[PDB]
Design an enzyme around this catalytic site. Structure first.
Site, PDB file in Angstrom:
ATOM      1  N   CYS A 109       0.820  -1.227   0.000  1.00 12.63           N
ATOM      2  CA  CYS A 109       0.000   0.000   0.000  1.00 12.63           C
ATOM      3  C   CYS A 109       0.847   1.267   0.000  1.00 12.63           C
ATOM      4  O   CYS A 109       1.616   1.525   0.936  1.00 12.63           O
ATOM      5  CB  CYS A 109      -0.954   0.035   1.215  1.00 12.63           C
ATOM      6  SG  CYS A 109      -1.946   1.559   1.390  1.00 12.63           S
ATOM      7  N   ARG A 112       0.102   4.593   3.006  1.00 15.64           N
ATOM      8  CA  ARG A 112       0.317   4.391   4.434  1.00 15.64           C
ATOM      9  C   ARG A 112       0.792   5.591   5.277  1.00 15.64           C
ATOM     10  O   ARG A 112       0.890   5.485   6.504  1.00 15.64           O
ATOM     11  CB  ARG A 112       1.314   3.246   4.617  1.00 15.64           C
ATOM     12  CG  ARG A 112       0.699   1.853   4.463  1.00 15.64           C
ATOM     13  CD  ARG A 112       1.766   0.800   4.680  1.00 15.64           C
ATOM     14  NE  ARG A 112       2.639   0.647   3.496  1.00 15.64           N
ATOM     15  CZ  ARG A 112       3.808   0.018   3.521  1.00 15.64           C
ATOM     16  NH1 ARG A 112       4.244  -0.473   4.670  1.00 15.64           N
ATOM     17  NH2 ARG A 112       4.546  -0.120   2.409  1.00 15.64           N
ATOM     18  N   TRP A 281      -9.365   6.625  -0.080  1.00 13.22           N
ATOM     19  CA  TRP A 281      -9.717   7.311  -1.318  1.00 13.22           C
ATOM     20  C   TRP A 281      -8.786   6.833  -2.466  1.00 13.22           C
ATOM     21  O   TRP A 281      -7.759   6.197  -2.218  1.00 13.22           O
ATOM     22  CB  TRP A 281      -9.626   8.814  -1.150  1.00 13.22           C
ATOM     23  CG  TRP A 281      -8.303   9.287  -0.585  1.00 13.22           C
ATOM     24  CD1 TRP A 281      -7.148   9.505  -1.276  1.00 13.22           C
ATOM     25  CD2 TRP A 281      -8.026   9.625   0.776  1.00 13.22           C
ATOM     26  NE1 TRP A 281      -6.166   9.947  -0.428  1.00 13.22           N
ATOM     27  CE2 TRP A 281      -6.678  10.031   0.839  1.00 13.22           C
ATOM     28  CE3 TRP A 281      -8.790   9.631   1.951  1.00 13.22           C
ATOM     29  CZ2 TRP A 281      -6.075  10.437   2.027  1.00 13.22           C
ATOM     30  CZ3 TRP A 281      -8.184  10.030   3.135  1.00 13.22           C
ATOM     31  CH2 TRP A 281      -6.843  10.426   3.165  1.00 13.22           C
ATOM     32  N   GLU A 286      -5.577   3.891 -10.432  1.00  9.40           N
ATOM     33  CA  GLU A 286      -6.383   2.711 -10.106  1.00  9.40           C
ATOM     34  C   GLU A 286      -7.601   2.652 -11.015  1.00  9.40           C
ATOM     35  O   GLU A 286      -7.972   1.582 -11.485  1.00  9.40           O
ATOM     36  CB  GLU A 286      -6.826   2.713  -8.637  1.00  9.40           C
ATOM     37  CG  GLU A 286      -5.697   2.541  -7.641  1.00  9.40           C
ATOM     38  CD  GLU A 286      -6.182   2.578  -6.194  1.00  9.40           C
ATOM     39  OE1 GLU A 286      -6.478   1.492  -5.663  1.00  9.40           O
ATOM     40  OE2 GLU A 286      -6.236   3.681  -5.586  1.00  9.40           O
TER      41      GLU A 286
HETATM   42  C1  HEM Z   1      -6.189   6.468   2.112  1.00  8.92           C
HETATM   43  C2  HEM Z   1      -5.881   6.381   0.816  1.00  8.92           C
HETATM   44  C3  HEM Z   1      -5.279   5.092   0.214  1.00  8.92           C
HETATM   45  C4  HEM Z   1      -4.666   5.045  -0.970  1.00  8.92           C
HETATM   46  C5  HEM Z   1      -4.429   6.230  -1.936  1.00  8.92           C
HETATM   47  C6  HEM Z   1      -4.248   3.682  -1.201  1.00  8.92           C
HETATM   48  C7  HEM Z   1      -3.574   3.213  -2.313  1.00  8.92           C
HETATM   49  C8  HEM Z   1      -3.371   1.874  -2.561  1.00  8.92           C
HETATM   50  C9  HEM Z   1      -3.060   1.296  -3.847  1.00  8.92           C
HETATM   51  C10 HEM Z   1      -2.919   2.109  -5.155  1.00  8.92           C
HETATM   52  C11 HEM Z   1      -2.916  -0.021  -3.683  1.00  8.92           C
HETATM   53  C12 HEM Z   1      -2.620  -1.023  -4.812  1.00  8.92           C
HETATM   54  C13 HEM Z   1      -4.014  -1.343  -5.352  1.00  8.92           C
HETATM   55  C14 HEM Z   1      -4.009  -2.179  -6.604  1.00  8.92           C
HETATM   56  O1  HEM Z   1      -3.192  -1.888  -7.512  1.00  8.92           O
HETATM   57  O2  HEM Z   1      -4.852  -3.114  -6.697  1.00  8.92           O
HETATM   58  C15 HEM Z   1      -3.142  -0.340  -2.284  1.00  8.92           C
HETATM   59  C16 HEM Z   1      -3.099  -1.593  -1.696  1.00  8.92           C
HETATM   60  C17 HEM Z   1      -3.511  -1.966  -0.421  1.00  8.92           C
HETATM   61  N1  HEM Z   1      -4.107  -1.140   0.557  1.00  8.92           N
HETATM   62 FE1  HEM Z   1      -4.027   0.991   0.369  1.00  8.92          FE
HETATM   63  N2  HEM Z   1      -4.636   2.916  -0.111  1.00  8.92           N
HETATM   64  C18 HEM Z   1      -5.282   3.751   0.789  1.00  8.92           C
HETATM   65  C19 HEM Z   1      -5.839   3.369   1.999  1.00  8.92           C
HETATM   66  C20 HEM Z   1      -5.843   2.129   2.613  1.00  8.92           C
HETATM   67  C21 HEM Z   1      -6.525   1.772   3.852  1.00  8.92           C
HETATM   68  C22 HEM Z   1      -7.373   2.768   4.686  1.00  8.92           C
HETATM   69  C23 HEM Z   1      -6.275   0.476   4.102  1.00  8.92           C
HETATM   70  C24 HEM Z   1      -6.722  -0.420   5.280  1.00  8.92           C
HETATM   71  C25 HEM Z   1      -7.199   0.067   6.437  1.00  8.92           C
HETATM   72  C26 HEM Z   1      -5.427  -0.029   3.026  1.00  8.92           C
HETATM   73  C27 HEM Z   1      -4.957  -1.326   2.885  1.00  8.92           C
HETATM   74  C28 HEM Z   1      -4.369  -1.848   1.734  1.00  8.92           C
HETATM   75  C29 HEM Z   1      -3.932  -3.220   1.540  1.00  8.92           C
HETATM   76  C30 HEM Z   1      -3.992  -4.422   2.513  1.00  8.92           C
HETATM   77  C31 HEM Z   1      -3.365  -3.296   0.133  1.00  8.92           C
HETATM   78  C32 HEM Z   1      -2.769  -4.581  -0.500  1.00  8.92           C
HETATM   79  C33 HEM Z   1      -3.856  -5.534  -0.988  1.00  8.92           C
HETATM   80  C34 HEM Z   1      -3.253  -6.800  -1.556  1.00  8.92           C
HETATM   81  O3  HEM Z   1      -2.230  -7.318  -1.021  1.00  8.92           O
HETATM   82  O4  HEM Z   1      -3.829  -7.304  -2.554  1.00  8.92           O
HETATM   83  N3  HEM Z   1      -5.207   1.000   2.145  1.00  8.92           N
HETATM   84  N4  HEM Z   1      -3.410   0.854  -1.630  1.00  8.92           N
HETATM   85  C1  LIG Z   2      -7.006  -7.819 -10.320  1.00 13.02           C
HETATM   86  N1  LIG Z   2      -6.047  -7.475  -9.255  1.00 13.02           N
HETATM   87  C2  LIG Z   2      -6.642  -7.746  -7.932  1.00 13.02           C
HETATM   88  C3  LIG Z   2      -7.922  -6.928  -7.788  1.00 13.02           C
HETATM   89  C4  LIG Z   2      -5.619  -7.423  -6.847  1.00 13.02           C
HETATM   90  C5  LIG Z   2      -6.289  -7.285  -5.493  1.00 13.02           C
HETATM   91  C6  LIG Z   2      -6.870  -8.381  -4.854  1.00 13.02           C
HETATM   92  C7  LIG Z   2      -7.486  -8.212  -3.610  1.00 13.02           C
HETATM   93  C8  LIG Z   2      -8.020  -9.197  -2.982  1.00 13.02           C
HETATM   94  N2  LIG Z   2      -8.478 -10.091  -2.398  1.00 13.02           N
HETATM   95  C9  LIG Z   2      -7.511  -6.961  -3.009  1.00 13.02           C
HETATM   96  C10 LIG Z   2      -6.933  -5.871  -3.645  1.00 13.02           C
HETATM   97  O1  LIG Z   2      -6.985  -4.661  -3.024  1.00 13.02           O
HETATM   98  C11 LIG Z   2      -6.222  -3.539  -3.465  1.00 13.02           C
HETATM   99  C12 LIG Z   2      -6.646  -2.332  -2.653  1.00 13.02           C
HETATM  100  C13 LIG Z   2      -7.063  -2.475  -1.331  1.00 13.02           C
HETATM  101  C14 LIG Z   2      -7.457  -1.365  -0.586  1.00 13.02           C
HETATM  102  C15 LIG Z   2      -7.446  -0.107  -1.175  1.00 13.02           C
HETATM  103  C16 LIG Z   2      -7.823   1.020  -0.455  1.00 13.02           C
HETATM  104  C17 LIG Z   2      -8.300   0.893   0.976  1.00 13.02           C
HETATM  105  C18 LIG Z   2      -7.787   2.259  -1.085  1.00 13.02           C
HETATM  106  C19 LIG Z   2      -7.360   2.358  -2.406  1.00 13.02           C
HETATM  107  N3  LIG Z   2      -7.307   3.557  -3.043  1.00 13.02           N
HETATM  108  N4  LIG Z   2      -6.999   1.243  -3.075  1.00 13.02           N
HETATM  109  C20 LIG Z   2      -7.027   0.032  -2.496  1.00 13.02           C
HETATM  110  C21 LIG Z   2      -6.632  -1.074  -3.234  1.00 13.02           C
HETATM  111  C22 LIG Z   2      -6.319  -6.029  -4.885  1.00 13.02           C
END
Ligand code: HEM
Ligand SMILES: CN[C@H](C)Cc1cc(C#N)cc(OCc2ccc3c(C)cc(N)nc3c2)c1
Ligand code: HEM
Ligand SMILES: CN[C@H](C)Cc1cc(C#N)cc(OCc2ccc3c(C)cc(N)nc3c2)c1
Ligand SMILES: C[C@H](O)[C@H](O)[C@H]1CNc2nc(N)[nH]c(=O)c2N1
Ligand SMILES: C[C@H](O)[C@H](O)[C@H]1CNc2nc(N)[nH]c(=O)c2N1
Ligand SMILES: [Zn+2]
Lengths: 410, 413
Positions: A109, A112, A281, A286
């Site tokens: 993420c 963070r 947000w 994305e």
């Molecule tokens: C506040 C603004 C936030 C922004 C701009 C942001 C941005 C992102 C982005 C761009 C990704 C990659 C997403 C993708 O390409 O599928 C990501 C992943 C992730 N976010 Fe954030 N995020 C935010 C907030 C949060 C919050 C509030 C949480 C949890 C409380 C969180 C938990 C996670 C987790 C666990 C992943 C990895 C998911 C995975 O392993 O598939 N995020 N975030």
């Molecule tokens: C096709 N590629 C897949 C969709 C990758 C992916 C899988 C899962 C799951 N389970 C969850 C995923 O979550 C990404 C994520 C999680 C949380 C987010 C928050 C809280 C904000 C944000 N702007 N993007 C997020 C993006 C991504």
């Protein structure tokens, strides 16, 4: 077992990592093979207490009370409760600390820098799908805040025997439907075609359009899941238009304001919360790079390049690349014009480098997955590209889990 | 370790099975509890060390020509063994040298261009004894590889390391690169990446033109002696002036680049033998010049100047003025090379060929090591097919390796 250095090849700044020494979960790599580009690599009383002790220990460490009377007493309390019930319950303070730190520890993420401003809703008293629906409606209303988005998570009861799991069957709270056409093509969002059929099979009457909001499919205490409609006034959406290209609004695109992931598992001190939707947000790419331009998604590069009158016969004209930049310009302009919170990949990657430096200073490291942290366009002109990163697994954490329609029995 | 490892493509759902990883030789830097995939880089061999390394290679070679366990295999094994036993080293046959060089390229996990690996022209320069001779071999390599714009991949291999005090080295990082000059006021003229090597050349006696695109001289070390300066004949250095198909003003920026990318500071390792001087060359992917050489902050850094002539709003990042300028620059680079009939490939074509290559390798070889962090291109990543491809990274031998800069280790005579 040294301290490991990380270098930024743009600034020549060098940070020193000690935090990785505290890691316990495996990453998937070996000494002979690296698997950093694999998406998903590879309890009872007996193993539960040590995991509980570790978490309680770092909590009282975080509040400068390690070894206090309160600390000792809490350990004793937790041992007696795993003893007599085969599980235990988190104090409210612990629940909040645990959720904030699962976000802090999420290697993938880029957002963070915001981790300590997380609004935590405790839904552990929930017993039915109707109550789930209520909690989720309150979450959506709070996090949306008329466009001034606020970060939030809602936590439903933890797993017990595995036959009574709480699940949100949706992968996000707000997503669009996708429909297999008679002519083989796909209407709407192709990423969601399977879930959409499950919903139709469950009694949902599909409007069959490009941007139909899916219903909530909610499972409480291991029972069959139930369908609910989100009240439309709670779903904020943005019509996509372009600041220079007048024809762009004629494309008829739009997207929702609130990204809210609902299919992950939250793990705190050995306990498992299988339903825990969390939201923040968007970063523009994305929506504008992945949601719209993936070959297996809405796939609109072709139409946009046509309207731009580009030469699409040869790849070396970079027509795909020009059209991509234009779509992402449009997404950012639209959200900003409607005062809906959004961040661009330049500003977001800046913030993350600042965050990294913060964490090395105050925590001794920051786990980070370069493959996911670097944005899906214009990589090397953002500062994270040139930043060396170390990836490792700390707990509390968010984890993947199986889709419930592969496991459930009715 | 498990015998079978699976990789998935998330765009096509195609799944491949890797067995080749079992043949992996050296460490990666990662462990069960940490991954170092984004780290840039995570006194000679004894007799006892050298025996099993040579045998491993000889076995590999005779297996590849379908003569494993043959009489000729067993004689070659014996010959090499006696040679190590009585000289502490051995010499490769011409065929073995050619095989080894091709497979060091085939095994290079960071190279997107490996569909071309079997077409490498190998030049044997193991009879070289002086720096003047090194210059002669290097001039012939450049002329053959350039081929008036129809570029052909090539490597020239100088004598292997012996006792470590007699190394052959090319001190240049590439055979062709532009000078960089640090000014008294803190600014830089030319290519900032080359300021250090330029200063070294000046100290050894080079008289610099002090311009923006001055080709550096070769600094060549033979048999462990002090290095010597040579000017490359200018008529052998093919260059391309950069223009844009739509913006007439782009030619006014006065940019140009050289046609031939030829890396010269790496070490080639075959059967335990070490070739410290082994310049190799191919042709460019556009982004190498257009994104990194031109738009990196610590390189020529021209985004701002291009953005100004495009009259973009540069006060907010969310206008994506940087992203817009970057595309036009990369358009102009590709356009200029094609117009002048100099071999070049765009990142879409290259990544697409690499996916086809990787599938063919999984099928005929049981795998293909690949470094996603380097394979995915520095712009428009997710709209190229390699972005969605899961990859396994591991190190096979023969291989190309990093080595220290020679001025840090050399004992001046
Ligand atoms: C506040 C603004 C936030 C922004 C701009 C942001 C941005 C992102 C982005 C761009 C990704 C990659 C997403 C993708 O390409 O599928 C990501 C992943 C992730 N976010 Fe954030 N995020 C935010 C907030 C949060 C919050 C509030 C949480 C949890 C409380 C969180 C938990 C996670 C987790 C666990 C992943 C990895 C998911 C995975 O392993 O598939 N995020 N975030
Ligand atoms: C096709 N590629 C897949 C969709 C990758 C992916 C899988 C899962 C799951 N389970 C969850 C995923 O979550 C990404 C994520 C999680 C949380 C987010 C928050 C809280 C904000 C944000 N702007 N993007 C997020 C993006 C991504
Ligand atoms: C023929 C056309 C070729 C193309 C288009 C090509 C493309 C590339 C690119 C784009 C990179 C990354 C460059 C960077 O970002 O610094 C690279 C790396 C590399 N290439 Fe190739 N390459 C080609 C030929 C060759 C040849 C002929 C060899 C050797 C015989 C070779 C060996 C390598 C090695 C060893 C690396 C990684 C170097 C390192 O680890 O720093 N390549 N290639
Ligand atoms: C600032 N980043 C640095 C320059 C990374 C790098 C280091 C070394 C070394 N030593 C060698 C490197 O080589 C990259 C390379 C090697 C061979 C290439 C060939 C043969 C063709 C081509 N088009 N690009 C290449 C690119 C790169
Ligand atoms: C920090 C990061 O590992 C480093 O900047 C790498 C990333 N990927 C790269 N990829 C290529 N092709 N070339 C490079 O120089 C780099 N630099
Ligand atoms: C195979 C590869 O790991 C996979 O496609 C990853 C690459 N990097 C990514 N990075 C982000 N932020 N999101 C993604 O979905 C992916 N996909
Ligand atoms: Zn790894």
């Amino acid at each position: 077992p040294r301290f490991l250095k990380v270098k930024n090849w743009e600034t020549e700044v060098v940070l020193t990592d000690t935090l990785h020494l505290k890691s316990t979960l495996e990453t998937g790599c070996t000494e002979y093979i690296c698997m950093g580009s694999i998406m998903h690599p590879s309890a009872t009383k007996d193993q539960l207490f040590p995991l509980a002790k570790e978490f309680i220990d770092q909590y009282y460490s975080s509040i400068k009370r390690f070894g206090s009377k309160a600390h000792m007493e809490r350990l004793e309390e937790v041992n007696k409760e795993i003893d007599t019930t085969s599980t235990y319950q988190l104090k409210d303070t612990e629940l909040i600390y645990g959720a904030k730190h699962a976000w802090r520890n999420a290697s993938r993420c880029v957002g963070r820098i915001q981790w300590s401003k997380l609004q935590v809703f405790d839904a552990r008293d929930c017993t039915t799908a109707h109550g789930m629906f209520n909690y989720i409606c309150n979450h959506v209303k709070y996090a949306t805040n008329k466009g001034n988005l606020r970060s939030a998570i809602t936590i439903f009861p933890q797993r017990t025997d595995g036959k009574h799991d709480f699940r949100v069957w949706n992968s996000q709270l707000i997503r669009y439907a996708g429909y297999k056409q008679p002519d083989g093509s796909t209407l709407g969002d192709p990423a969601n075609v399977q879930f959409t059929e499950i919903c139709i099979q469950q009694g949902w009457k599909p409007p069959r359009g490009r941007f139909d909001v899916l219903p909530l499919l909610l499972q409480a205490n291991g029972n069959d899941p139930e369908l609910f409609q989100i009240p439309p006034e709670l779903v904020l959406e943005v019509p996509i238009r372009h600041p220079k290209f007048e024809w762009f609004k004629d494309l008829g695109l739009k997207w929702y304001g609130l990204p809210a992931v609902s299919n992950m598992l939250l793990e705190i001190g050995g306990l498992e919360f299988s339903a825990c939707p969390f939201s923040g947000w968007y970063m523009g790419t994305e929506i504008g790079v992945r949601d719209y331009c993936d070959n297996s998604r809405y796939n609109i590069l072709e139409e946009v390049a046509k309207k731009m009158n580009l030469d699409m016969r040869k790849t070396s004209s970079l027509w795909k690349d020009q059209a991509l930049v234009e779509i992402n310009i449009a997404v950012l302009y639209s959200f900003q014009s409607d005062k809906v919170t959004i961040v661009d990949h330049h500003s977001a990657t800046e913030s993350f480098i600042k965050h990294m430096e913060n964490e090395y200073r105050c925590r001794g490291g920051c786990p980070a997955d370069w493959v996911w942290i670097v944005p899906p366009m214009s990589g090397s002109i953002t500062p994270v590209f040139h930043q060396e990163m170390l990836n490792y697994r700390l707990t509390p954490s968010f984890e993947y889990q199986p889709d419930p329609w592969n496991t459930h029995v009715w």
